[PDB]
From a paper:
The Eph receptors are the largest receptor tyrosine kinase family, and together with their cell surface-anchored ephrin ligands represent an important cell-cell communication system that regulates a multitude of physiological and pathological processes. EphA2 promotes cancer malignancy through a poorly understood non-canonical form of signaling involving serine/threonine phosphorylation of the linker connecting its kinase and SAM domains. The kinase-SAM linker contains a cluster of five serine/threonine residues that besides S897 include S892, T898, S899 and S901.
To determine whether the negative charges introduced by phosphorylation of the linker might affect the kinase-SAM domain arrangement, we solved the structures of two EphA2 phosphomimetic mutants. In the second EphA2 mutant, we replaced only S901 with glutamic acid. The EphA2 S901E structure is essentially identical to the WT structure, in agreement with the lack of definition of residue S901 in the structures and suggesting that S901 phosphorylation alone does not significantly affect the conformation of the EphA2 intracellular region.
Author numbering: 587 to 635, 639 to 772, 778 to 898, 905 to 976
Amino acid sequence: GPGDPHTYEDPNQAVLKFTTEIHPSCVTRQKVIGAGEFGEVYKGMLKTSKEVPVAIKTLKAGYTEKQRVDFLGEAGIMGQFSHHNIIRLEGVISKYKPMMIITEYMENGALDKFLREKDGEFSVLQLVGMLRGIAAGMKYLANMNYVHRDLAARNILVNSNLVCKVSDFGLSRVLEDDPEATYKIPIRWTAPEAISYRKFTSASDVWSFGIVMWEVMTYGERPYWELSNHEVMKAINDGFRLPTPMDCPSAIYQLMMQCWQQERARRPKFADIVSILDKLIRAPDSLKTLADFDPRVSIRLPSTPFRTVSEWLESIKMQQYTEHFMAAGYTAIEKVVQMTNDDIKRIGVRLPGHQKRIAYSLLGLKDQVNTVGIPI
Ligand SMILES: Nc1ncnc2c1ncn2[C@@H]1O[C@H](COP(=O)(O)OP(=O)(O)CP(=O)(O)O)[C@@H](O)[C@H]1O
Ligand SMILES: [Mg+2]
């Protein structure tokens, strides 16, 4: 559960501890439903001690032990999760060939392919509900201190009741074909700081979630499809952003833009995203106002106010002092603007460089708070 110790960096141990070894005789492989990286994927039935329908991921013959470890490690990770919007693991087969990962059956398959199949056949409210489910799954993952690093519509599965669940777990996931090498990551879904500095956090997952929102509201359009990967690199590094989908509520596109904030600290947390989507869903009239859709627009020009002290500290990469600011009562912004350099020093900022950085930032923050701009 959340808060308990996790095993995200030891695949074999996670397989031993958090997966159920299933006897091959209890598995019935039926039709082929897809092709994974490590082998074919089948639909089948599993007998437990009544038969239940399941998805069966197999490991190709002639595999290397490294591929076997990476394959079963996904199940080792999946077995630690229990949530409505996270793909559920039934078990594994590691003792006998072929290696198998057995999960719940998701009849409608990948979300992007599903939405392209059902182009325009859902209401806006239903799409928002799909996004809310994905966001709830991601909130659970963030609360489990698990960074997905590869959140995308193609990695969201849909069952016969249209429940959307996050899938695709593991560690060294350079395997996906969309990722391309740089400085191997799916650049069209990856936050700027994660492409430049490989800083993968839940905030970069929030960026990816904004991209997923775009994918859902467009019914599976490829992000930046007009642009090459190099042009996408320039676009994201310079502040260009995707335009609004057609028939997209203004609040949803604004949420997208919030997920795409250049500074990761300003992006909302997944808990905030779930709450926001819940509020929109309970008052569906809030979804009637649409963002201006221009079919000729393919990309938005770069865009040109802190709520928490932690947001401002992470802005200047001084988050390591955040706890020290709260513990001394400096919990508001209009209270940190009333700080002297000695107050900064006593709460535990000793390095002169950090003192200088914080002081220079406080000057600009005082400028911000005292700004007046009221149109007459
Ligand atoms: N639980 C499930 N229910 C129904 N179909 C499933 C399924 N799991 C996988 N599939 C099908 O198999 C396809 C690929 O599966 P999967 O994504 O797990 O392989 P993979 O993770 O190795 C690709 P990548 O490495 O690029 O992320 C999916 O597109 C999907 O159609
Ligand atoms: Mg996978």
